[model samples]
Target chain A: SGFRKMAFPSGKVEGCMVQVTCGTTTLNGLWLDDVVYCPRHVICTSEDMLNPNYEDLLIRKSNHNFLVQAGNVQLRVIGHSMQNCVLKLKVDTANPKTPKYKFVRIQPGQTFSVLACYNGSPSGVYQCAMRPNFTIKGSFLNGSCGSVGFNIDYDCVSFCYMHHMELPTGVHAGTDLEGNFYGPFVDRQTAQAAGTDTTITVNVLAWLYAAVINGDRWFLNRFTTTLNDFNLVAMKYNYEPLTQDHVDILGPLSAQTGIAVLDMCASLKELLQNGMNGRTILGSALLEDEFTPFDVVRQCSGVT
Target chain B: SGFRKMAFPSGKVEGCMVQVTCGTTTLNGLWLDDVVYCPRHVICTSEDMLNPNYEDLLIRKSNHNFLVQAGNVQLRVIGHSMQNCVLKLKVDTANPKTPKYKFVRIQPGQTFSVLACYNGSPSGVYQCAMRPNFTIKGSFLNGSCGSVGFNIDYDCVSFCYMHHMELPTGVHAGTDLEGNFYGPFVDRQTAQAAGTDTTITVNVLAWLYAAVINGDRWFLNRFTTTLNDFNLVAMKYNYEPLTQDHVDILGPLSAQTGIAVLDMCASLKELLQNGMNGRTILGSALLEDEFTPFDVVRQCSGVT
Candidate 1:
């Protein structure tokens, strides 16, 4: 339902081989190929991509002080000094903008959630913050309070196109399998539009992470198909592969995600399932064939 | 120091291929090829082997009123009415045979361990039982007062050879990486020795399991090496490949053990370290192209 029936470069309605682009990244595909491989040079230029910082990627030590759990158009704040925390999720502007936030006395070992949806859907540029609310009636602990904007629907608009894909906060939200926490998801629209960009790359990591550890071939195959659909949209826009500047953001994202995916164990059953399901997760992600649109999650709990 | 220099079938003192017999099964190997694949015809005859009982294999409903936790020369009993349950371990005769008897009230939520060894080394045919000592205890429940023989040392001799590779009570013993509990691994030796062999086929399934999950080429290569080494010793004895009966045993062993090893998720680093240190934890049971010869681990931690 999410993809359209379109002819591929091979001049067939299906199984057509072609290259498509979205944002600064490009993905190669075949209409019948559930998974596709795209090299860095296929669409992006070296000058447009940045070299990934390997050192930052290797530092896996967690800063357990603050945690983010996402839900439908919301983000939850869980901290040791949670009682004093004020959480906010809002669209970004020249300065922090507006949102209707609720205050609840979070129970011990529970979290406080915030909803920042407009017209029942969470979209556009939004910033989220969790900090000590000094004005609130409670003894507060000093904590790191910063804000970051996340355009969760940017990809849906830029590439997914004509599809209302909901990026929720539960398992279907591409959140943790247990509905726990997720990494920061920042604004990619602004960065992709500008030649030079800045955004925490780790935010989108959960998409690949969830796909790998879940060990569900049904999920993997469908996700790859979604990428091909998105690629088709990108090709229609006459886009190109990612550039070196974009690579600075995506290269490490791909490498770290690649490492994590490979680090995961797929059972013979799961491996066989992926093969039988008309898709292959392993062979398609090999070295030379580096980049792809597989990092995006298309359908979420039927939201798409 | 654990392995002695050995010769193989090539008779050149180096490339000599050999086979060694362990329990009722035999493995083939070469000095040149660290790992060798064997077909079912290489081992037992159809007359001697009964086809696998797929029905019994699928009926996974465990009669879990009892449990066995094996350790170094010990089999701890965990069962309802276990406080009154007396446990034993011994090499099999026409009847259940020897080992010291000990009675201490099993702690609440704890198992009672018993020394099921001879001369400090557990070997040969053994029988284990858990029965109510009505006279020494309070009013007890009449459970299955049964004694069953298990050859705990069978795999140890067949594969482990010299080094102590305790298949413990957890995922390290065949559970998953998240330390999730796995399927039951009951008496394999008894089943294999009898024509009604019903144990898992893959004993070293962890190698492939871990390799697939870990996705580390180095770890995979080393593990295959260890398997080939074990096969060399198997072939030296004019041993045949696994028969269907042998498979009746190995298939389950490998599946269970494979499930466990992959479940454990040790990396190439862990495998190599387990091999190098004294009282090796892993990376042994490889072939030698001897008795007291197969269990010495090779080096490979650096390869990855």
Candidate 2:
């Protein structure tokens, strides 16, 4: 299985691949033909061309060759060469036929960070290229890419840091791209310096559950989306599947919840450059509790 | 007025002052004799001995001679020479008469730490006295010593390493002497590396408010205690007192509230030992928002 794990930049794919022909050569690396006969007395080509669920066909590929870690959850893309690089992705769950073409190019020697949350894009999915080439087309776990979030820190109190992601709108959207799937921190000195704390985890279930109780569509939908994606990935990857819906598993943003993706690159640069420590003795209790979750998330990857 | 503001190890005193017998001697050097009274109609030797409200009396004194800065809240004693050092003042609110006659010794060149949260001291306060004999009696914004906390760091969101204090608990019974308060780093390595982040502040109102909605007494209590202390200290020292109760104006632990005063010295030791910057942009948003409150706490010192 020459499948050495490649860092999968883009998350799991949901829709089927479109037909791509390179001259006389045809490459069906992982997908099936457009139309073929199938059981149920159906034509394989007759399968929903618009929205073909790749639910049964399981093939993991590394997209980025890099690993993105947010607290605990570490995301890796299946391996793909440079030319097959992930130019850009559309994070809308609204079933689309032709991929809305956005192709943002990543320069060599540079890294791109992304947030993968949900609900037809709580934050609208903007693309790079006006017309995306089929070669560069990729998939979204929720609305973005495969992300990792760990319960890095927790105070067991109300003021914890919550999941290290950015809120969908506001200044956060521009800021939270690299750290956790959400809040934590990434390249920025601030987040990098943040290390891990209860600010990263708490009893979000009760708090976000209350969100649904109050009907915050933004929270409810995104919560469900993340949860759904959470479960989908688990179920798909053979990890123990969790019963909770996205809303059900909602933890805290400090009992805190989804840190909406805020900003990245320069903003994070400003934050990272501003990087800033201490300690032992009593602070260790939270140290014990939160670190376990951080470890748990680390183990979630099932990587050594 | 040649008082030249000697270096007091504690903080400011409230009310006014009672007379001490050193007249013409103007020895104003320090210390007072027993039984001094008010001017108007009070007995010259009739100052209430037990539970003296000192409502109309106040005096400043320094016990440690060493300044204590738990992150932002800096504590300075009024002024008291070595022989009048703090033996041990029972951390009680009842306002005792004979000072309970408990004198712990402090070794020279050593530092002591304490947590000022209360109610059977859920905040837990402790001190050191290996060879210390400095006269310093202080007031409590809550159950612990006078404390200060500021959302002093901003880039606000990620690179946030809010000052470290404690979670308010048992065993943590000691440990919180000073330096950092709580909840900044994770383990020895990380915390040591955790320079800072927005762990410094947020919509604690909404989050802490949710704790109340959830009926979480622990969280609610702690949150309010911190908030109350925040306002109390502010009002007491004329720091634009926030109008919230102990259940309001909540701030970080060392900010003068519920820093259970967990374990650090070690992790902090690690951080302070190793130690470690970035971010600009909208963090400035919080810069404006969080700074005023920080300034409020700063001025709460009545330090001027």
Candidate 3:
């Protein structure tokens, strides 16, 4: 009886093509169980990228690497190293005459954008966005520069965003990288777009290292202590409990987060032995499931 | 750079067979990645069954259903129903004179065992053991029970067994079913044997249903409150922080734990409407990743 009920689909069966409508935009993709594959190129702006559901549907290969193609633009994301996560962009369109590049960082639900410009752009300028509408917008000057292509090297940090019920008591909100934030949102499409900067993303290990270096017991104990104690403190503060949805979203990330924490502790021990001080701040937190050594963090954090 | 470093083993390559020594005994099993498989039959007693490491190596076909054979005794475990998880035992041995069946429950690290005797045994008396040495020892009275075979129906429940450092502040200790308790244990083989009954295992959903029916805020709020509040209370008590090992072990189980909690909440709502009361305790915290309807729990809980 159990065997009959628990039988899975025969092998990885290819399912039918489906059309997914996110707000005003619709994308045609092949559906395989929970994931959708877009073989044909599609076009999406920052608005489409802001939808959490859309982010969930975005294609990722078995290894969690992302390869996305939108019209004339193609973006490839792969884990480069412990220090540098790489995002490469290729635009088949003609290059700009002025050959200028503009990088704009837009936080979803916020009206303002952080803009930075560069002159004499490289092969091309790359722009990518993440869930909750965090976008890194890059545009090349609209003239004939060769086909545009460039790499964006960024750090990945974990952020703890909370609701009125769930305060910042070390419960993970989401992860941030390359100007884009990814996590589960209650009303991902609308609430995220209208949300405030509840918490800033930080390399948690780095912050812990800072705390250890400075002997900030208050900060160190906040996370380093037992989970029961952590929850008790939240109770004392009358923070509302996390909703089931929040728990579901953050649950899977817990292992990687804890691993990162342990790796940070090990790295800090090594750094302290080498005469590291409070002045040194580690860069990106170690990626989950990756065995990052102290040397990688040291190089990434600009110790050299 | 990330791609170069993160490259996986090319395809599912067969690895070498490895010998695993457990206490005084040694097992020869094939090592593929993290899991070990034994194509040949092996012999183990309650002593070997008590070891946590050995329990980890016990073969389970890909679907988490176990198919274990030691000598002439063969045990197959499959998720029969939400109400009844099935354990079918087969023994290819000569029938005994008495044809008696003995079921013994052994708590690892403990000297005593709970024994139950049955007459006119079915095809066989199946003995199965779980981690931390919880075992259901079934023996066909050494003459003949006609090739000894039988089915043991049991319920799966979640238990919170905390260390002195971690108190009972709702952190999951492990899940229990049949006669076995499965969870991350520190020094599992040694510590579990000498472990106290810190907490009894129960279907968490059933307990929650009871709490809801009785309107137990103290109990409800213990878990229902935000994680921050929960940790704050833990702090007030000055509980020690969870070790990195603990965190690593428990992190992955978080999602399924949360899902069970949510499912329990939904089931309670449905039960109350259907005239369920405090006296009616639901059974078997629904298996993770299975769509267990409320009716299954109702039937399993023994409420006709």
List runs of model 3 lying over 4 Å from the truth: A1-30, A33-304, B1-36, B39-66, B69-304
**Residues A1-304, model 1: lDDT tens digits:** 1110010011011111223232343322211122221121212233433543223322321223112222222222221111111111121111121122111222111111111112121111111211111011010011101111111222111011001011211000111111121223211111211121121112222333333423323333212223333334334422222233433433443463463221221221133234334342321221111112222222211111
TM for every model, in the order presented, reads: 0.16, 0.17, 0.19
Q: Candidate 2 DockQ score?
A: 0.01
- CA lDDT, candidate 3, residue B107: 33
Q: What is the number of backbone collisions in each predicted candidate, taken in the order shown?
A: 62, 159, 45
| DockQ each | 0.01, 0.01, 0.01
**Winning candidate number (TM-score):** 3
True contacts kept of each: 0.00, 0.00, 0.00
Kindly report which residue stretches of model 2 are placed more than 4 angstroms away from their true locations once superposed.
A1-224, A232-304, B1-116, B123-304
| Worst 10-residue lDDT window, candidate 2 chain B | B1-10
Question: Per-residue lDDT for B169-275 in model 2, tens only?
Answer: 11111111121222232212122322211221222232222222222223222222343445443343222323433223344423343332121112112222232
Docking class for candidate 1: incorrect
| Per-residue lDDT of candidate 1, residues B161-276 (tens digit) | 01101121100111111111122322121221112112111323323332232232344332323333433443443323223343343243235335322222233224423543
Interface RMSD list for the candidates: 31.3, 27.9, 28.0
Q: Taking the tens digit of each residue's C-alpha lDDT, what string does model 3 give over A100-211?
A: 2222332322111111111111111111222132221222121111111121122211111101111121111212223222334332334333222221112223334333
